[PDB]
Amino acid sequence: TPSRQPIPSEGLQLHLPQVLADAVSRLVLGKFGDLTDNFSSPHARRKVLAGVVMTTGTDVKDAKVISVSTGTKCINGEYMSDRGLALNDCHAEIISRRSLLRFLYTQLELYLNNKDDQKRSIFQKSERGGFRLKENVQFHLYISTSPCGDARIFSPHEPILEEPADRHPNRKARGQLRTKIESGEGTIPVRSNASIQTWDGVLQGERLLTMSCSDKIARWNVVGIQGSLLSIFVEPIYFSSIILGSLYHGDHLSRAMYQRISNIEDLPPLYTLNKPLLSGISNAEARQPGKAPNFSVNWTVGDSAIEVINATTGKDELGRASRLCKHALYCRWMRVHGKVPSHLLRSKITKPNVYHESKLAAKEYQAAKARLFTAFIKAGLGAWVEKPTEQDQFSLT
Amino acid sequence: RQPIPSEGLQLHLPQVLADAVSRLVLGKFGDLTDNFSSPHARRKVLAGVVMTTGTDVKDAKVISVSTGTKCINGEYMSDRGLALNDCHAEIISRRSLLRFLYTQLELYLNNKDDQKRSIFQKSERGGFRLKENVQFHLYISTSPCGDARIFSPHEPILEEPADRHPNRKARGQLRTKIESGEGTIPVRSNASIQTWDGVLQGERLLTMSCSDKIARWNVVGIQGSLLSIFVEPIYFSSIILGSLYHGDHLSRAMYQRISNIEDLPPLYTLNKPLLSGISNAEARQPGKAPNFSVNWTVGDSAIEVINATTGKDELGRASRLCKHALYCRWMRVHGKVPSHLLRSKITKPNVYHESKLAAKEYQAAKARLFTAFIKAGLGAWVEKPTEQDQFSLT
RNA sequence: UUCCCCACAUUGACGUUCAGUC
RNA sequence: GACUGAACGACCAAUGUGGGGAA
Ligand SMILES: O=P(O)(O)O[C@H]1[C@H](OP(=O)(O)O)[C@@H](OP(=O)(O)O)[C@H](OP(=O)(O)O)[C@@H](OP(=O)(O)O)[C@H]1OP(=O)(O)O
Ligand SMILES: O=P(O)(O)O[C@H]1[C@H](OP(=O)(O)O)[C@@H](OP(=O)(O)O)[C@H](OP(=O)(O)O)[C@@H](OP(=O)(O)O)[C@H]1OP(=O)(O)O
Ligand SMILES: [Zn+2]
Ligand SMILES: [Zn+2]
C-alpha cells in the first residue's frame, strides 16, 4: 500500500524512520503504563493517547519520554475562565505540547540555576542572542491516531485519488480549516461567512470554536512548538517527527501537516515551514467503537504522578486549576524572566505584566502567525478563529 | 393486533390484501432463491414492496425484495458514496423501489409507444405523477426497529393486550441504531451532531431507526429528494407485517405521534396508510443473523448480495443501490428530461448534497417533519456528518 | 396514570473453541 | 486469508416486568 508508507523528514535524519516510529510508540505507551499501575488504573481509560519524546543523538536508545497525555474533548463555552485558569483544549496532542512547555521552562531554570548544571541542560546560550537547543537535540510527537481535523477527513477503506496533477476538472480546496464542536470529539468546516466569537455571547450558549488539531499542528510547523511567551527566551523549536498509532495516510497527513500552506511567504529569520518525518507504526491500533472518557490525563517528566482534568470544565474534578493552564505557564515564565538577565532576552520586556500584552512582546512569533493566517486564507482554506480578546487579559499573584 | 383501515373510500379488502402481499413477497423471494435452498437464502428479516394497478388482486406485481438486519461499520463509510449505510430489510426494499421508479421514468421518456406502458404521466403542475390506480404496499416480515418494536418485541398474546403505559415519556421517542450495541436509543441522550473524524476515531455511528424512517416516508414520500425533482410525492398505501404486530405501537410510530405537523408544502401531507398483521404470522428464523443483505428489483436477472458491515459486495464492488449509483441514474434521466418538465428548475452544481438541495419543497417538507418531532418532545433527527454527501461523479 | 429506587429479565459488536467452503 | 456456521464467555444503553416508594 503506497498510502501506508513513511514520509521522510525535511529536517535532520538521525535515525531510520521505522525504527524511530516503533521506538517512540513503544516508549510512550510503556511510560503511560508505568504511570497507570500497568493500565489497571481507572485513569488509564482513554480513546486517544499522545506523547512527546526527546533524542540527544543518533543512538536510538538515548530517548526520553518527555510527556504523556490522553484526551479527546474540549471545554464547554459556559465554563471558560477569565483569569486563564481553564484549559480550553484537552485533546491528547494539545495537552502533550503544553506539558512539553513545562519541560522547557524547567530546562531554562536548570541552566540558569548554576553553571555546573548548564552541561546538563538541553539549552545553551545562542550566538544570535537568547538561547538555542544543543546541536543534536530533537523532539518527536506521537499520537495514538491521526489528529482531528483535515488529517482524518478521508475514507480509510478506499484508495486515494484526491487531486490529479492537472488542474482539478471540478473545483479546488481539499485542505479546509475545521473546528472542534463543543460537546464532541468531532470536527466541522469553518464557515466562509466568518463571524468572530465574543466573550459574554459564547458564555451564554453560542458555539465555542476551537481550531482542529490538524490545523493546530500545522501552526506548530510554522511558528514552532514553544508558543509566543517562550520565544522571548528561546529560538523556535519544531517537531522533527510525527508518529501515528492508527489512521495513517501519507497523502492526507503530509497535506494537513504542511503541504496545504506551502504558499507561505516572508517568514521571519529562523522561522520556516517545517516538514517533519511522518510515519505510522508497524502494529497499528484497531478502532474501538464505544464511549470516550470525559477526562484528560497529563504528565511531564519530573512529575511524580499524572494529573487528571475534567475536559468539559478545563479543571480537575475538584475544580483546581491545572499545572498546564495559562495562569500556571505565566507563573513559570515570570519566574524564569526573573532569573534571566535583560541583555539575554530575545526581545524587550517593555509591555505591561498582563498575559496578552506579554504575548505581544514576541513581535517575530506574532509576525509568523500573521503570515500563517494569511497563508490559509490565500490558499482558499478558510480563516483562523481566535478566542475573544478578554480571554488573555489577566495578571498574577 | 387487528388491521387499522386507511382513508375515506376503501378500495381493497384489508386481510385479503395483507395475506396477498405477504404471500407474494415471500414467494418471489422463493423463486429468487431456488426455493429457499440458495446460499444466500438465510435471513432474519425479509422485506418487499408490492405494486397494485387495480382492484384485481391478481393484477399485483412484486416490485422489490430484500433481507438484512445490520448497519455499516464506522471505518467503512465512503466519501465517494459507494457504501450502503443502512441494510435493515425495509430500508433496502425502499431503495430497490427507487431503482424501479427511475426505470419507469426512463421508460416514459424513451418513446411515445412506450409512454402507455410507464406508470408515470405528465402532471398539470409540471413534472410527473403516478397514473390514477397505482399503489405501493410495504411488507416487512417483522415490526420495524424503533418505536413500533422496542416495547412489546414479542407476539401479542392478543386479548388486546394494549399498552398498559401509553403515556410514558419513552413512547414515540425518536431512536437510533447504535454501532456496536443492541437496542435502539433516544436521541435526547445523544445531543451533539455526528462528525466524520469523530466516527472514524471510534465514536459510535448512529443510524435513524426504521420506525422513524418510515414515519418520515409518511411525510416526505418514499421517492426522496432527488426523484422529487422529477415526480410528485409518492406514498406507501399499506404497511404489512409478517410478525410482531401491535396496532397501537405501529400506528403511533408510523404517524400518529406526529399529527401535530403543520405547514407542509403543496402535495405533501401526513400519510396514514393501512396497517395490518397477517393471517398466519411467520416463524422466528433460526440461527446466527447473517452479515449479508440481499436485494432485488423487478427487471433484474440476478439478486445482489451486499456485506452489511462494509456496504459493498463480496469483492468490494459498489452496490446498484448506493448513493453513487442512484446519482448516476438521476443524472441520466435529468439529461433526458426537457427543462419545461421539471418540478424544480433551480440549477445547482453537480455534487450530491447540492443536487439534493434543488428539491426545495421536499427539503421544506423535511423541515416541517423534523420540527414536528421536536415540538412533540420526541427528539431531534440525527443525520450523517455533512461530509457524506460532498462528492461528484468524478 | 406518571415518575423514583431496587431486583430480575429482554434486545448489535467483541473474545474463545469447534466444524466447513473458496 | 477471506467468507460461512454451531456452541460457549463477556459487553453494549435502552426497554420490560416485579416489589417497594412518591406526585
Ligand atoms: O495549546 P492551545 O490549547 O491551543 O492554546 C493556544 C495558545 O494559548 P496559550 O498558550 O495562551 O494557552 C495560543 O497562544 P500562542 O502561544 O500561540 O500565542 C493561542 O494563540 P494566541 O495567543 O495567538 O491568541 C491560542 O488561542 P486562539 O488561537 O484561540 O486565540 C490557543 O488555542 P486555544 O484557544 O484553542 O487554547
Ligand atoms: O434509505 P436510507 O439508507 O435511509 O438513505 C437515506 C437517504 O440518503 P440517500 O438516498 O442519499 O442514500 C436520505 O436522503 P433523501 O433521499 O431522503 O433526501 C438521507 O437524508 P438527507 O438527504 O436529508 O441527508 C439519509 O441520511 P441522513 O438523514 O442520515 O443525513 C439517508 O439515510 P442513512 O444516512 O441512514 O443511509
Ligand atoms: Zn484533536
Ligand atoms: Zn430496522
PDB file of N, CA, C and O in Angstrom, chain A residues 72 149 152-159 178 181-183 185-189 247 287-290, chain B residues 73-80 179-180 192-193 195-204 312 387:
ATOM      1  N   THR A  72      -9.840  13.579  24.473  1.00  0.00           N
ATOM      2  CA  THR A  72     -10.481  13.704  23.174  1.00  0.00           C
ATOM      3  C   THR A  72     -11.544  14.760  23.143  1.00  0.00           C
ATOM      4  O   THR A  72     -12.245  14.874  22.143  1.00  0.00           O
ATOM      5  N   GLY A 149      -9.566  16.984  12.557  1.00  0.00           N
ATOM      6  CA  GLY A 149      -9.474  17.971  11.509  1.00  0.00           C
ATOM      7  C   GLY A 149      -9.070  17.330  10.210  1.00  0.00           C
ATOM      8  O   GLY A 149      -9.355  16.155   9.975  1.00  0.00           O
ATOM      9  N   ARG A 152      -7.800  13.607   9.118  1.00  0.00           N
ATOM     10  CA  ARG A 152      -8.626  12.443   9.418  1.00  0.00           C
ATOM     11  C   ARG A 152      -9.842  12.374   8.488  1.00  0.00           C
ATOM     12  O   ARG A 152     -10.506  11.347   8.413  1.00  0.00           O
ATOM     13  N   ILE A 153     -10.175  13.479   7.825  1.00  0.00           N
ATOM     14  CA  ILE A 153     -11.298  13.501   6.878  1.00  0.00           C
ATOM     15  C   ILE A 153     -10.935  12.717   5.615  1.00  0.00           C
ATOM     16  O   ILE A 153     -10.428  13.309   4.656  1.00  0.00           O
ATOM     17  N   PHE A 154     -11.199  11.406   5.613  1.00  0.00           N
ATOM     18  CA  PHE A 154     -10.951  10.533   4.453  1.00  0.00           C
ATOM     19  C   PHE A 154     -11.466   9.113   4.672  1.00  0.00           C
ATOM     20  O   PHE A 154     -11.762   8.716   5.791  1.00  0.00           O
ATOM     21  N   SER A 155     -11.634   8.377   3.584  1.00  0.00           N
ATOM     22  CA  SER A 155     -12.173   7.018   3.631  1.00  0.00           C
ATOM     23  C   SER A 155     -11.039   6.007   3.700  1.00  0.00           C
ATOM     24  O   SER A 155     -10.421   5.687   2.687  1.00  0.00           O
ATOM     25  N   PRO A 156     -10.777   5.473   4.895  1.00  0.00           N
ATOM     26  CA  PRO A 156      -9.656   4.546   5.043  1.00  0.00           C
ATOM     27  C   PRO A 156      -9.843   3.168   4.401  1.00  0.00           C
ATOM     28  O   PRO A 156      -8.933   2.366   4.500  1.00  0.00           O
ATOM     29  N   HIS A 157     -10.974   2.868   3.782  1.00  0.00           N
ATOM     30  CA  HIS A 157     -11.071   1.616   3.041  1.00  0.00           C
ATOM     31  C   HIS A 157     -11.325   1.891   1.560  1.00  0.00           C
ATOM     32  O   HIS A 157     -11.898   1.072   0.836  1.00  0.00           O
ATOM     33  N   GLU A 158     -10.847   3.047   1.116  1.00  0.00           N
ATOM     34  CA  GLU A 158     -10.905   3.402  -0.286  1.00  0.00           C
ATOM     35  C   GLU A 158      -9.610   4.021  -0.761  1.00  0.00           C
ATOM     36  O   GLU A 158      -9.041   4.871  -0.087  1.00  0.00           O
ATOM     37  N   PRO A 159      -9.148   3.601  -1.940  1.00  0.00           N
ATOM     38  CA  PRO A 159      -7.926   4.173  -2.493  1.00  0.00           C
ATOM     39  C   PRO A 159      -8.065   5.674  -2.757  1.00  0.00           C
ATOM     40  O   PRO A 159      -9.140   6.180  -3.099  1.00  0.00           O
ATOM     41  N   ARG A 178     -10.955  23.591  10.057  1.00  0.00           N
ATOM     42  CA  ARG A 178     -12.072  22.949  10.707  1.00  0.00           C
ATOM     43  C   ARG A 178     -11.990  23.167  12.219  1.00  0.00           C
ATOM     44  O   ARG A 178     -10.913  23.397  12.767  1.00  0.00           O
ATOM     45  N   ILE A 181     -16.222  20.912  17.643  1.00  0.00           N
ATOM     46  CA  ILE A 181     -17.554  21.333  18.033  1.00  0.00           C
ATOM     47  C   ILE A 181     -17.659  21.039  19.499  1.00  0.00           C
ATOM     48  O   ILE A 181     -17.216  19.998  19.987  1.00  0.00           O
ATOM     49  N   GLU A 182     -18.172  22.018  20.211  1.00  0.00           N
ATOM     50  CA  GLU A 182     -18.334  21.912  21.637  1.00  0.00           C
ATOM     51  C   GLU A 182     -19.178  20.667  21.879  1.00  0.00           C
ATOM     52  O   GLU A 182     -20.066  20.360  21.074  1.00  0.00           O
ATOM     53  N   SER A 183     -18.835  19.914  22.927  1.00  0.00           N
ATOM     54  CA  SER A 183     -19.541  18.676  23.295  1.00  0.00           C
ATOM     55  C   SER A 183     -19.232  17.524  22.326  1.00  0.00           C
ATOM     56  O   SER A 183     -20.078  16.666  22.063  1.00  0.00           O
ATOM     57  N   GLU A 185     -15.967  15.040  20.074  1.00  0.00           N
ATOM     58  CA  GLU A 185     -14.624  14.694  19.705  1.00  0.00           C
ATOM     59  C   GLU A 185     -14.470  15.024  18.238  1.00  0.00           C
ATOM     60  O   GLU A 185     -13.372  15.016  17.693  1.00  0.00           O
ATOM     61  N   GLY A 186     -15.593  15.321  17.601  1.00  0.00           N
ATOM     62  CA  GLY A 186     -15.583  15.582  16.182  1.00  0.00           C
ATOM     63  C   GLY A 186     -15.147  16.963  15.724  1.00  0.00           C
ATOM     64  O   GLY A 186     -14.703  17.800  16.518  1.00  0.00           O
ATOM     65  N   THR A 187     -15.248  17.178  14.414  1.00  0.00           N
ATOM     66  CA  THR A 187     -14.792  18.394  13.769  1.00  0.00           C
ATOM     67  C   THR A 187     -15.640  18.780  12.561  1.00  0.00           C
ATOM     68  O   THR A 187     -16.126  17.906  11.849  1.00  0.00           O
ATOM     69  N   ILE A 188     -15.923  20.068  12.394  1.00  0.00           N
ATOM     70  CA  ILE A 188     -16.692  20.549  11.237  1.00  0.00           C
ATOM     71  C   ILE A 188     -15.971  21.716  10.546  1.00  0.00           C
ATOM     72  O   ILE A 188     -15.266  22.460  11.212  1.00  0.00           O
ATOM     73  N   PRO A 189     -16.156  21.901   9.214  1.00  0.00           N
ATOM     74  CA  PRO A 189     -15.530  23.023   8.483  1.00  0.00           C
ATOM     75  C   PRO A 189     -15.808  24.402   9.079  1.00  0.00           C
ATOM     76  O   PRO A 189     -16.739  24.557   9.871  1.00  0.00           O
ATOM     77  N   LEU A 247      -4.788   5.140  11.650  1.00  0.00           N
ATOM     78  CA  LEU A 247      -5.352   6.061  10.662  1.00  0.00           C
ATOM     79  C   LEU A 247      -4.260   6.853   9.926  1.00  0.00           C
ATOM     80  O   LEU A 247      -4.446   8.025   9.570  1.00  0.00           O
ATOM     81  N   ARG A 287      -9.617   0.378  15.694  1.00  0.00           N
ATOM     82  CA  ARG A 287     -10.690   1.268  16.152  1.00  0.00           C
ATOM     83  C   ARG A 287     -11.539   0.581  17.227  1.00  0.00           C
ATOM     84  O   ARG A 287     -12.022  -0.530  16.998  1.00  0.00           O
ATOM     85  N   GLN A 288     -11.687   1.193  18.406  1.00  0.00           N
ATOM     86  CA  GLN A 288     -12.606   0.649  19.424  1.00  0.00           C
ATOM     87  C   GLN A 288     -13.873   1.473  19.508  1.00  0.00           C
ATOM     88  O   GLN A 288     -13.892   2.497  20.180  1.00  0.00           O
ATOM     89  N   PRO A 289     -14.954   1.019  18.886  1.00  0.00           N
ATOM     90  CA  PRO A 289     -16.152   1.849  18.985  1.00  0.00           C
ATOM     91  C   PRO A 289     -16.783   1.771  20.391  1.00  0.00           C
ATOM     92  O   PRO A 289     -17.017   0.682  20.930  1.00  0.00           O
ATOM     93  N   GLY A 290     -17.119   2.930  20.947  1.00  0.00           N
ATOM     94  CA  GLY A 290     -17.616   3.000  22.310  1.00  0.00           C
ATOM     95  C   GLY A 290     -17.322   4.336  22.969  1.00  0.00           C
ATOM     96  O   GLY A 290     -16.733   5.221  22.349  1.00  0.00           O
TER      97      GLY A 290
ATOM     98  N   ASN B  73     -20.208  -0.549   9.378  1.00  0.00           N
ATOM     99  CA  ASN B  73     -19.208  -0.284  10.390  1.00  0.00           C
ATOM    100  C   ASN B  73     -18.706   1.117  10.156  1.00  0.00           C
ATOM    101  O   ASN B  73     -18.851   1.624   9.042  1.00  0.00           O
ATOM    102  N   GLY B  74     -18.154   1.754  11.189  1.00  0.00           N
ATOM    103  CA  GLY B  74     -17.673   3.121  11.064  1.00  0.00           C
ATOM    104  C   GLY B  74     -16.547   3.285  10.051  1.00  0.00           C
ATOM    105  O   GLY B  74     -16.626   4.165   9.187  1.00  0.00           O
ATOM    106  N   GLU B  75     -15.517   2.432  10.121  1.00  0.00           N
ATOM    107  CA  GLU B  75     -14.349   2.562   9.232  1.00  0.00           C
ATOM    108  C   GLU B  75     -14.711   2.532   7.746  1.00  0.00           C
ATOM    109  O   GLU B  75     -13.952   3.006   6.891  1.00  0.00           O
ATOM    110  N   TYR B  76     -15.883   2.006   7.433  1.00  0.00           N
ATOM    111  CA  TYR B  76     -16.156   1.675   6.057  1.00  0.00           C
ATOM    112  C   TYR B  76     -17.071   2.698   5.394  1.00  0.00           C
ATOM    113  O   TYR B  76     -17.504   2.493   4.258  1.00  0.00           O
ATOM    114  N   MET B  77     -17.378   3.790   6.091  1.00  0.00           N
ATOM    115  CA  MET B  77     -18.114   4.862   5.439  1.00  0.00           C
ATOM    116  C   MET B  77     -17.350   5.393   4.220  1.00  0.00           C
ATOM    117  O   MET B  77     -16.144   5.596   4.285  1.00  0.00           O
ATOM    118  N   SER B  78     -18.060   5.680   3.134  1.00  0.00           N
ATOM    119  CA  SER B  78     -17.413   6.123   1.902  1.00  0.00           C
ATOM    120  C   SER B  78     -17.663   7.589   1.570  1.00  0.00           C
ATOM    121  O   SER B  78     -18.813   8.041   1.496  1.00  0.00           O
ATOM    122  N   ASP B  79     -16.582   8.308   1.289  1.00  0.00           N
ATOM    123  CA  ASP B  79     -16.666   9.731   0.980  1.00  0.00           C
ATOM    124  C   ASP B  79     -17.051   9.915  -0.489  1.00  0.00           C
ATOM    125  O   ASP B  79     -17.349  11.028  -0.921  1.00  0.00           O
ATOM    126  N   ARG B  80     -16.984   8.835  -1.266  1.00  0.00           N
ATOM    127  CA  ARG B  80     -17.415   8.895  -2.651  1.00  0.00           C
ATOM    128  C   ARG B  80     -18.827   8.313  -2.799  1.00  0.00           C
ATOM    129  O   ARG B  80     -19.392   8.305  -3.904  1.00  0.00           O
ATOM    130  N   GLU B 179     -23.972   1.872  16.711  1.00  0.00           N
ATOM    131  CA  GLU B 179     -22.946   0.918  16.312  1.00  0.00           C
ATOM    132  C   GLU B 179     -22.381   0.165  17.513  1.00  0.00           C
ATOM    133  O   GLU B 179     -22.147   0.764  18.552  1.00  0.00           O
ATOM    134  N   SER B 180     -22.196  -1.146  17.376  1.00  0.00           N
ATOM    135  CA  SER B 180     -21.604  -1.964  18.439  1.00  0.00           C
ATOM    136  C   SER B 180     -22.436  -2.131  19.688  1.00  0.00           C
ATOM    137  O   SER B 180     -21.877  -2.338  20.748  1.00  0.00           O
ATOM    138  N   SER B 192     -25.292  16.049  20.687  1.00  0.00           N
ATOM    139  CA  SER B 192     -24.390  16.669  19.700  1.00  0.00           C
ATOM    140  C   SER B 192     -24.498  16.015  18.313  1.00  0.00           C
ATOM    141  O   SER B 192     -25.061  14.926  18.163  1.00  0.00           O
ATOM    142  N   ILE B 193     -24.014  16.716  17.291  1.00  0.00           N
ATOM    143  CA  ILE B 193     -24.160  16.254  15.919  1.00  0.00           C
ATOM    144  C   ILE B 193     -23.049  15.264  15.566  1.00  0.00           C
ATOM    145  O   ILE B 193     -22.007  15.260  16.223  1.00  0.00           O
ATOM    146  N   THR B 195     -19.913  13.646  13.474  1.00  0.00           N
ATOM    147  CA  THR B 195     -18.777  14.060  12.631  1.00  0.00           C
ATOM    148  C   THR B 195     -18.031  12.902  11.952  1.00  0.00           C
ATOM    149  O   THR B 195     -18.075  11.750  12.417  1.00  0.00           O
ATOM    150  N   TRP B 196     -17.317  13.209  10.872  1.00  0.00           N
ATOM    151  CA  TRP B 196     -16.612  12.160  10.129  1.00  0.00           C
ATOM    152  C   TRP B 196     -15.447  11.621  10.947  1.00  0.00           C
ATOM    153  O   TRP B 196     -15.311  10.423  11.181  1.00  0.00           O
ATOM    154  N   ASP B 197     -14.603  12.524  11.401  1.00  0.00           N
ATOM    155  CA  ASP B 197     -13.429  12.105  12.125  1.00  0.00           C
ATOM    156  C   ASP B 197     -13.759  11.595  13.518  1.00  0.00           C
ATOM    157  O   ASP B 197     -13.017  10.788  14.088  1.00  0.00           O
ATOM    158  N   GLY B 198     -14.912  12.003  14.029  1.00  0.00           N
ATOM    159  CA  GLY B 198     -15.353  11.538  15.329  1.00  0.00           C
ATOM    160  C   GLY B 198     -15.751  10.076  15.252  1.00  0.00           C
ATOM    161  O   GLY B 198     -15.371   9.255  16.098  1.00  0.00           O
ATOM    162  N   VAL B 199     -16.548   9.759  14.237  1.00  0.00           N
ATOM    163  CA  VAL B 199     -16.906   8.385  13.956  1.00  0.00           C
ATOM    164  C   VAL B 199     -15.685   7.526  13.661  1.00  0.00           C
ATOM    165  O   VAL B 199     -15.543   6.433  14.214  1.00  0.00           O
ATOM    166  N   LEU B 200     -14.786   8.029  12.817  1.00  0.00           N
ATOM    167  CA  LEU B 200     -13.585   7.272  12.479  1.00  0.00           C
ATOM    168  C   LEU B 200     -12.683   7.016  13.659  1.00  0.00           C
ATOM    169  O   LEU B 200     -11.972   6.020  13.691  1.00  0.00           O
ATOM    170  N   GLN B 201     -12.752   7.887  14.654  1.00  0.00           N
ATOM    171  CA  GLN B 201     -11.879   7.765  15.811  1.00  0.00           C
ATOM    172  C   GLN B 201     -12.440   6.693  16.736  1.00  0.00           C
ATOM    173  O   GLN B 201     -11.717   6.075  17.509  1.00  0.00           O
ATOM    174  N   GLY B 202     -13.741   6.469  16.665  1.00  0.00           N
ATOM    175  CA  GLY B 202     -14.301   5.400  17.451  1.00  0.00           C
ATOM    176  C   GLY B 202     -15.639   5.731  18.061  1.00  0.00           C
ATOM    177  O   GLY B 202     -16.242   4.891  18.746  1.00  0.00           O
ATOM    178  N   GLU B 203     -16.085   6.970  17.877  1.00  0.00           N
ATOM    179  CA  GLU B 203     -17.392   7.314  18.391  1.00  0.00           C
ATOM    180  C   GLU B 203     -18.392   6.486  17.593  1.00  0.00           C
ATOM    181  O   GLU B 203     -18.221   6.283  16.397  1.00  0.00           O
ATOM    182  N   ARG B 204     -19.438   6.017  18.250  1.00  0.00           N
ATOM    183  CA  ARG B 204     -20.374   5.079  17.628  1.00  0.00           C
ATOM    184  C   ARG B 204     -21.282   5.716  16.583  1.00  0.00           C
ATOM    185  O   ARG B 204     -22.007   6.670  16.860  1.00  0.00           O
ATOM    186  N   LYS B 312     -20.456  -2.804   0.721  1.00  0.00           N
ATOM    187  CA  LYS B 312     -20.132  -3.217  -0.643  1.00  0.00           C
ATOM    188  C   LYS B 312     -20.294  -4.730  -0.773  1.00  0.00           C
ATOM    189  O   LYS B 312     -20.536  -5.421   0.227  1.00  0.00           O
ATOM    190  N   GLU B 387     -20.033  15.810   5.604  1.00  0.00           N
ATOM    191  CA  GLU B 387     -19.046  15.347   4.636  1.00  0.00           C
ATOM    192  C   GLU B 387     -19.570  14.233   3.703  1.00  0.00           C
ATOM    193  O   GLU B 387     -19.176  14.149   2.538  1.00  0.00           O
TER     194      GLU B 387
END
